[PDB]
Scaffold this active site. Structure first.
Site, short mmCIF file in Angstrom:
data_model
loop_
_atom_site.label_atom_id
_atom_site.label_comp_id
_atom_site.label_asym_id
_atom_site.label_seq_id
_atom_site.Cartn_x
_atom_site.Cartn_y
_atom_site.Cartn_z
N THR A 1 0.86 -1.18 0.00
CA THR A 1 0.00 0.00 0.00
C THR A 1 0.89 1.23 0.00
N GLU B 1 -10.29 -1.88 -2.04
CA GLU B 1 -10.84 -2.26 -0.75
C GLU B 1 -10.80 -1.11 0.26
N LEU C 1 13.35 -7.31 -14.00
CA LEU C 1 13.04 -6.07 -14.68
C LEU C 1 13.33 -6.43 -16.13
N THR D 1 9.41 4.25 8.26
CA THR D 1 9.48 5.26 9.30
C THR D 1 8.42 6.34 9.17
N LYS E 1 37.56 -0.55 28.02
CA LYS E 1 37.21 -0.06 26.69
C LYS E 1 36.37 1.19 26.86
N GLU F 1 24.94 -0.75 26.55
CA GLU F 1 25.12 -1.56 27.75
C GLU F 1 24.77 -0.83 29.04
N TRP G 1 36.11 9.60 36.75
CA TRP G 1 37.37 9.58 36.04
C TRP G 1 37.89 10.98 35.75
N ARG H 1 47.15 1.45 9.91
CA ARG H 1 47.47 1.32 8.50
C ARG H 1 48.41 2.35 7.87
N1 LIG Z 1 37.36 5.37 39.84
C1 LIG Z 1 38.02 4.32 39.36
N2 LIG Z 1 39.29 4.14 39.91
C2 LIG Z 1 40.09 3.08 39.55
N3 LIG Z 1 39.66 2.17 38.62
C3 LIG Z 1 38.42 2.33 38.06
C4 LIG Z 1 37.56 3.39 38.40
N4 LIG Z 1 36.44 3.20 37.64
C5 LIG Z 1 36.54 2.12 36.89
N5 LIG Z 1 37.78 1.56 37.14
C6 LIG Z 1 38.33 0.30 36.51
O1 LIG Z 1 37.79 0.26 35.18
C7 LIG Z 1 36.89 -0.82 35.03
C8 LIG Z 1 35.54 -0.33 34.50
O2 LIG Z 1 35.38 -0.76 33.15
P1 LIG Z 1 35.06 0.32 32.00
O3 LIG Z 1 33.99 1.32 32.44
O4 LIG Z 1 36.33 0.97 31.65
O5 LIG Z 1 34.58 -0.49 30.68
P2 LIG Z 1 34.98 -1.93 30.10
O6 LIG Z 1 35.94 -2.64 31.02
O7 LIG Z 1 35.59 -1.61 28.81
O8 LIG Z 1 33.64 -2.73 29.70
P3 LIG Z 1 32.52 -3.40 30.66
O9 LIG Z 1 32.24 -2.40 31.77
O10 LIG Z 1 31.23 -3.69 29.88
O11 LIG Z 1 33.09 -4.64 31.27
C9 LIG Z 1 36.80 -1.52 36.38
O12 LIG Z 1 36.77 -2.93 36.20
C10 LIG Z 1 38.01 -1.04 37.16
O13 LIG Z 1 39.12 -1.88 37.20
N1 LIG Z 2 4.24 6.34 10.90
C1 LIG Z 2 4.62 5.08 10.78
N2 LIG Z 2 5.80 4.79 11.47
C2 LIG Z 2 6.34 3.53 11.45
N3 LIG Z 2 5.72 2.51 10.75
C3 LIG Z 2 4.55 2.78 10.06
C4 LIG Z 2 3.96 4.06 10.05
N4 LIG Z 2 2.84 3.92 9.27
C5 LIG Z 2 2.71 2.67 8.82
N5 LIG Z 2 3.77 1.94 9.30
C6 LIG Z 2 4.04 0.46 9.06
O1 LIG Z 2 3.74 0.20 7.67
C7 LIG Z 2 2.67 -0.71 7.54
C8 LIG Z 2 1.56 -0.18 6.64
O2 LIG Z 2 1.40 -1.04 5.51
P1 LIG Z 2 0.54 -0.52 4.27
O3 LIG Z 2 -0.88 -0.11 4.68
O4 LIG Z 2 1.28 0.59 3.66
O5 LIG Z 2 0.50 -1.67 3.16
P2 LIG Z 2 0.91 -3.21 3.17
O6 LIG Z 2 1.42 -3.64 4.52
O7 LIG Z 2 1.85 -3.36 2.08
O8 LIG Z 2 -0.38 -3.97 2.73
P3 LIG Z 2 -1.71 -4.11 3.61
O9 LIG Z 2 -2.82 -3.17 3.06
O10 LIG Z 2 -2.11 -5.55 3.60
O11 LIG Z 2 -1.33 -3.72 5.04
C9 LIG Z 2 2.17 -1.03 8.94
O12 LIG Z 2 1.86 -2.42 9.00
C10 LIG Z 2 3.31 -0.59 9.87
O13 LIG Z 2 4.18 -1.57 10.37
N1 LIG Z 3 21.00 -6.05 -20.08
C1 LIG Z 3 20.82 -6.82 -19.02
N2 LIG Z 3 21.98 -7.04 -18.27
C2 LIG Z 3 21.96 -7.84 -17.15
N3 LIG Z 3 20.80 -8.46 -16.75
C3 LIG Z 3 19.65 -8.24 -17.47
C4 LIG Z 3 19.61 -7.43 -18.63
N4 LIG Z 3 18.32 -7.47 -19.06
C5 LIG Z 3 17.58 -8.24 -18.27
N5 LIG Z 3 18.41 -8.73 -17.27
C6 LIG Z 3 18.01 -9.64 -16.16
O1 LIG Z 3 17.16 -10.62 -16.77
C7 LIG Z 3 15.89 -10.65 -16.16
C8 LIG Z 3 14.76 -10.52 -17.17
O2 LIG Z 3 14.26 -11.82 -17.48
P1 LIG Z 3 14.16 -12.28 -19.01
O3 LIG Z 3 13.43 -11.25 -19.87
O4 LIG Z 3 15.53 -12.52 -19.51
O5 LIG Z 3 13.36 -13.70 -19.04
P2 LIG Z 3 12.99 -14.84 -17.93
O6 LIG Z 3 13.51 -14.48 -16.57
O7 LIG Z 3 13.52 -16.11 -18.43
O8 LIG Z 3 11.40 -15.01 -17.99
P3 LIG Z 3 10.28 -13.90 -17.55
O9 LIG Z 3 9.41 -13.51 -18.77
O10 LIG Z 3 9.46 -14.44 -16.42
O11 LIG Z 3 11.06 -12.68 -17.05
C9 LIG Z 3 15.87 -9.56 -15.11
O12 LIG Z 3 15.35 -10.13 -13.93
C10 LIG Z 3 17.31 -9.07 -14.96
O13 LIG Z 3 18.02 -9.35 -13.78
MG LIG Z 4 31.80 -1.13 28.41
MG LIG Z 5 32.51 -5.55 28.76
MG LIG Z 6 -2.40 -3.59 0.26
#
Ligand SMILES: Nc1ncnc2c1ncn2[C@@H]1O[C@H](COP(=O)(O)OP(=O)(O)OP(=O)(O)O)[C@@H](O)[C@H]1O
Ligand SMILES: Nc1ncnc2c1ncn2[C@@H]1O[C@H](COP(=O)(O)OP(=O)(O)OP(=O)(O)O)[C@@H](O)[C@H]1O
Ligand SMILES: Nc1ncnc2c1ncn2[C@@H]1O[C@H](COP(=O)(O)OP(=O)(O)OP(=O)(O)O)[C@@H](O)[C@H]1O
Ligand SMILES: [Mg+2]
Ligand SMILES: [Mg+2]
Ligand SMILES: [Mg+2]
Ligand SMILES: Nc1ncnc2c1ncn2[C@@H]1O[C@H](COP(=O)(O)OP(=O)(O)OP(=O)(O)O)[C@@H](O)[C@H]1O
Ligand SMILES: Nc1ncnc2c1ncn2[C@@H]1O[C@H](COP(=O)(O)OP(=O)(O)OP(=O)(O)O)[C@@H](O)[C@H]1O
Ligand SMILES: [Mg+2]
Ligand SMILES: [Mg+2]
Ligand SMILES: [Mg+2]
Ligand SMILES: [Mg+2]
Ligand SMILES: [Mg+2]
Lengths: 491, 74, 62, 506
Positions: free
Chosen positions: A40, A64, A212, A227, A281, A305, A318, A446
């Site tokens: 849609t 529809e 295509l 979105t 880290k 995290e 720190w 690098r």
């Molecule tokens: N005020 C502080 N003085 C001395 N050491 C510190 C202090 N704060 C943190 N640390 C040290 O740094 C560590 C904290 O980890 P940090 O925040 O740097 O991230 P990380 O180790 O990269 O990842 P993760 O927290 O997910 O394990 C501690 O384990 C500790 O040894």
């Molecule tokens: N503002 C919005 N922000 C984020 N997502 C949205 C927003 N509006 C719609 N959507 C998403 O897009 C979908 C809308 O689908 P849409 O009505 O365009 O057609 P469709 O899903 O292709 O076919 P059908 O009519 O069966 O739903 C929703 O199911 C939802 O997840």
């Molecule tokens: N110039 C081109 N260079 C590279 N790929 C192409 C080119 N033209 C068409 N294609 C590829 O070929 C496909 C088109 O299908 P094609 O017309 O060759 O017949 P088919 O797949 O055997 O049968 P159908 O009638 O169901 O498409 C596209 O999906 C596309 O990826």
């Molecule tokens: Mg961390």
């Molecule tokens: Mg960690």
């Molecule tokens: Mg639809």
């Protein structure tokens, strides 16, 4: 027109990149998918972009949903449809049946309708026409062979008309048949599929161009995001390897570190700080973001995290005061569990935000916390998505990876990202005299030269203080050293 | 063509005729058919296989979100 | 004739290598696949190369 | 022969083994499989052989293919059926539908066909029959109920008639239901299933005998190939363990080695060369083919890694002129990629090349090469394959296996073949003082004594130089040994000062 196929860009962020130009002009394109996939939307957004960007009026034909609704909802992405119907730039050809009726009206209407359609096309000088839920029409009492003739009547007609189309189709199995009757499939000149995969109880939208006729395109699936500004598709594969490279440097937040890196971290580059849990880290990050607040610059910190409050805390302990860092709008903290979404939705949030704070530096608080619960092939992608972005954007990127096993880990990384990173900062624990002492090392840079020794270091309220290498030890890497105490040359 | 209201048998016979008459002229012919599942039946109606002297399959195998194109001679 | 089977060349890079010579003369080869796999192209390229390389007229039925 | 059912030989390479003698006389075997599986061929070959080897005429009932084509195609394998249809040894019965037909005809014509066939058989005095693609007939408008009763009529009458018939059938899936209507499987006395399993993009055909009412037969799947000679089967299980053993010994091409092996390799034996990449297996093989030539005996080299060109290059640089070996008509190099076909195929080429050349020695450089992608079971089965042929043919064999982890590999097998092998040769790296030196080792020999030393070796333009052992080293096998000395300076040739000469004079 003895030239290569002609495409009419869609302006749907990314579709034009994957379709090497977009829907071939005057032809029909089939966007099929299971309920909730986008369809849609996609067609709507199809017409829209066509009007508000090239003045190519559109004909929308619902089978529809009532026009009143197509509008109502559209207000979701900030666009008043009512306006283009008032300005006669888009025509919602109501085609949905009413509460009452009759039956035995098979191909009966499929014909009358092709007139009401050609009608508005000629009448509104249409160019972009989109029909949503063509399927919901034959779901009256037909079979495959019946459908293949009612559809083909239309498209055949529309091609004549000279209008470029987009037909909606509904599917039941995400990977089964292309369209409810496996008939449309070969009836369209180009097929597009909206996949909304489950897996992990998390969902991931994915768009693909199966074919295509008459042109080339991008084979495969692509993650997209629904979105507020509509559909959005990141062609992570499409992205090119033409990033800008400068030999300019930037501080680490740690002097003695900067020295080791032989001058510092190049501006255009990716840095990875690996180390067991605890190593510090998150420290290095904290300090790397203050240095971007001294040179009065905007930088962002994405933590998955710790929280907002706790970070501040462990930050004031720190020395560095983030409180200020925020007021002086030069620093932005995000915070969100990895489980609150999926890599697709994340890769975006990062992007989006990045555009609204024009950073100069950026660090993500644990990639491995982001790879939590997701396939490697999926993560390895997400990174290449943030890693490349920041790259062709001049933003220096330092990321955080917490190896699964402290001491003895035989790889700076587990998911296999080192190949993607330029500079590698490795923090390891080192058991000396019954104590868990640290160590920091520029594993690789690098361009620069960086320091080749493994320097110990401790953490104080003043931050990190790099020290001296364990010149007299062995097996440092392993973690469990062994002193040589070489008896000199023994005189 | 068989997509008008036919079943396996009817379709099986028809290919037989078509193909067969074409054999008579001395025309080397190449026929295009549509499928449903990359590995499922070789041809839509579970018949075309056995009816042709030569069979060629073009698969657009998905996998890992990347599509791989293959061609085979059964 | 009174020997093995005679083949024709399709001049399609590879295929004629795979098929040990190309399609067999006087017979229908069934190329089937899913939507967008090659078929038509294979069908067209078949006729085309026929003309453009041995001067063998081709009829295409659509 | 102890069986209660009189069987008749198909003369098809491997069938009469699998079917414990061939198809039961007076009954009917349902040979069915998917598409491009072998069906008609099997039937055609069946009639053929009964004609070219027993002077048994036979009737061939074709249902979809044309009586002309059945003869047209049969030539592919070199069969002049036209000549047989001419000599009245082979009657082809055309029941194919018409390009200008009506619609409705598969029941009374079934009453008619029986009568038709009864005429051919009675006129040609046939003892074998092949109905091809019965399926297509019901393929007009029928269901399981009309299929079980209609076939049955045919079969049954055919049985009374006394003809040993063979019926073909199509079936969509490769592993699901045997036949289409899933009914032909129980009306028949015997059921033969042909498959063309996919797996890894390659293709493996197999033949299987689900059932032979009344006798016994080989169970499960057996790989067969279609050549210019027809179907060919490998009863890789009917390969009894009764090959000859001889204390006879032969040269390795390396004399110090022959010592290491109690006096040269055994003739009837399987030799296994294992070592990390770059150690020198390839080499030992060369010096193995070479010597078999320097003794005027034939031998073949099947390379799956290097080219026939490069194999000659490195061979010459190592001495030994392979160029001549080829011309002298003593050595033959095959050379081929493993990815150029599945095992079943390879296994045959190799056999092929061993019957057109009759070598007395054979080398397969890198079995672990063939193990690429393939599932162990499939590999282990192929290994027992080659190995098993060379063992019952007095054809010494040297297989080379490259281990996936240099220095530190805890098993010189990786695929676990170390039990099929009669004698193993071990090469590996040894980090000695910052250097990558190699050392050899004779790990096992079934009947010999061989040298238990882990002697180091060096390579020159001349070849594998077998030096001495690292007696003064612990943790050898480890890749990076430890130096512990109780001596070293100990005699051997102490005497200091001026011990040498130089190039001028001695
Ligand atoms: N005020 C502080 N003085 C001395 N050491 C510190 C202090 N704060 C943190 N640390 C040290 O740094 C560590 C904290 O980890 P940090 O925040 O740097 O991230 P990380 O180790 O990269 O990842 P993760 O927290 O997910 O394990 C501690 O384990 C500790 O040894
Ligand atoms: N503002 C919005 N922000 C984020 N997502 C949205 C927003 N509006 C719609 N959507 C998403 O897009 C979908 C809308 O689908 P849409 O009505 O365009 O057609 P469709 O899903 O292709 O076919 P059908 O009519 O069966 O739903 C929703 O199911 C939802 O997840
Ligand atoms: N110039 C081109 N260079 C590279 N790929 C192409 C080119 N033209 C068409 N294609 C590829 O070929 C496909 C088109 O299908 P094609 O017309 O060759 O017949 P088919 O797949 O055997 O049968 P159908 O009638 O169901 O498409 C596209 O999906 C596309 O990826
Ligand atoms: Mg961390
Ligand atoms: Mg960690
Ligand atoms: Mg639809
Ligand atoms: N000389 C040959 N060498 C190698 N393969 C051959 C040779 N001749 C034919 N083949 C192969 O044998 C197969 C022919 O199958 P065959 O016509 O015998 O019956 P089928 O596949 O069982 O049934 P169907 O009538 O439906 O095709 C083909 O797959 C073809 O590749
Ligand atoms: N002319 C030569 N002179 C000295 N040493 C050589 C010469 N040629 C090869 N070598 C040595 O022999 C090794 C080559 O190994 P070889 O060709 O015997 O087979 P391999 O190690 O069993 O298997 P692969 O080479 O495929 O890994 C080299 O690593 C090298 O040290
Ligand atoms: Mg098509
Ligand atoms: Mg087509
Ligand atoms: Mg077949
Ligand atoms: Mg056949
Ligand atoms: Mg080699």
């Amino acid at each position: 027109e003895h030239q290569a196929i002609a495409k009419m860009r869609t302006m749907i962020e990314g579709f034009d990149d994957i379709s090497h130009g977009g829907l071939p002009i005057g032809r029909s394109t089939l966007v099929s998918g299971t309920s909730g996939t986008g369809k849609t939307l996609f067609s709507i957004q199809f017409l829209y972009n066509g009007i508000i960007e090239f003045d190519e009026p559109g004909v929308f034909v619902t089978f529809e949903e009532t026009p009143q609704d197509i509008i109502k909802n559209a207000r979701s992405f900030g666009w008043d449809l009512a306006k283009l119907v008032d300005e006669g730039k888009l025509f919602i050809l109501d085609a949905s049946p009413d509460p009452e009726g009759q039956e035995v009206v098979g191909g009966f209407d499929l014909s009358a309708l092709i007139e009401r359609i050609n009608y508005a096309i000629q009448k509104y000088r249409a160019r972009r026409v989109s029909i949503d839920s063509v399927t919901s029409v034959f779901q009256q009492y037909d079979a495959s062979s019946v459908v293949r003739r009612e559809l083909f009547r239309l498209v055949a007609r529309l091609k004549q008309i000279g209008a470029t189309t987009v037909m909606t189709t509904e599917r039941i199995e995400e990977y089964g048949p292309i369209a409810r009757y496996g008939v449309e499939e070969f009836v369209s000149d180009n097929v597009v599929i909206l996949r909304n995969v489950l897996e992990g109880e998390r969902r991931r939208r994915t768009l693909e161009i199966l074919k295509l006729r008459g042109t080339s395109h991008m084979k495969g699936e692509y993650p997209f995001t629904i979105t507020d500004h509509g559909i959005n598709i990141f062609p992570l594969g499409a992205m090119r390897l033409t990033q800008r490279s400068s030999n300019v440097r930037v501080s680490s937040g740690v002097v003695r570190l900067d020295e080791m890196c032989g001058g510092g971290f190049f501006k255009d580059s990716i840095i990875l700080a690996t180390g067991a849990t605890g190593t510090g880290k998150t420290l290095l990050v904290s300090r790397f973001v203050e240095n971007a607040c001294a040179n009065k610059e905007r930088a962002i910190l994405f933590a998955y995290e710790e929280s907002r409050a706790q970070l501040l805390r462990n930050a004031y302990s720190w020395g560095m005061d983030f409180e200020e860092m925020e007021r002086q709008n030069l620093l932005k903290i995000v915070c969100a569990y990895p489980e609150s979404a999926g890599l697709e939705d994340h890769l975006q949030i990062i992007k989006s935000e990045i555009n609204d704070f024009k950073p100069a530096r950026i660090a993500i608080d644990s990639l491995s916390a982001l790879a939590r619960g997701v396939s490697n092939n999926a993560f390895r992608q997400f990174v290449i998505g943030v890693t490349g972005y920041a790259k062709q954007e001049e933003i220096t990127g330092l990321f955080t990876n917490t190896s699964d096993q402290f001491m003895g880990a035989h790889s700076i990384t587990d998911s296999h990202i080192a190949e993607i990173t330029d500079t590698i900062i490795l923090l390891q624990y080192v058991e000396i005299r019954g104590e868990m002492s640290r160590a920091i090392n520029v594993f690789k840079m690098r361009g620069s030269w960086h320091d080749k020794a493994i320097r110990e270091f401790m953490i104080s309220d003043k931050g990190p203080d790099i020290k001296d290498s364990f010149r007299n030890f062995e097996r440092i890497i392993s973690g469990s050293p062994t002193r040589i105490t070489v008896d000199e040359k023994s005189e």
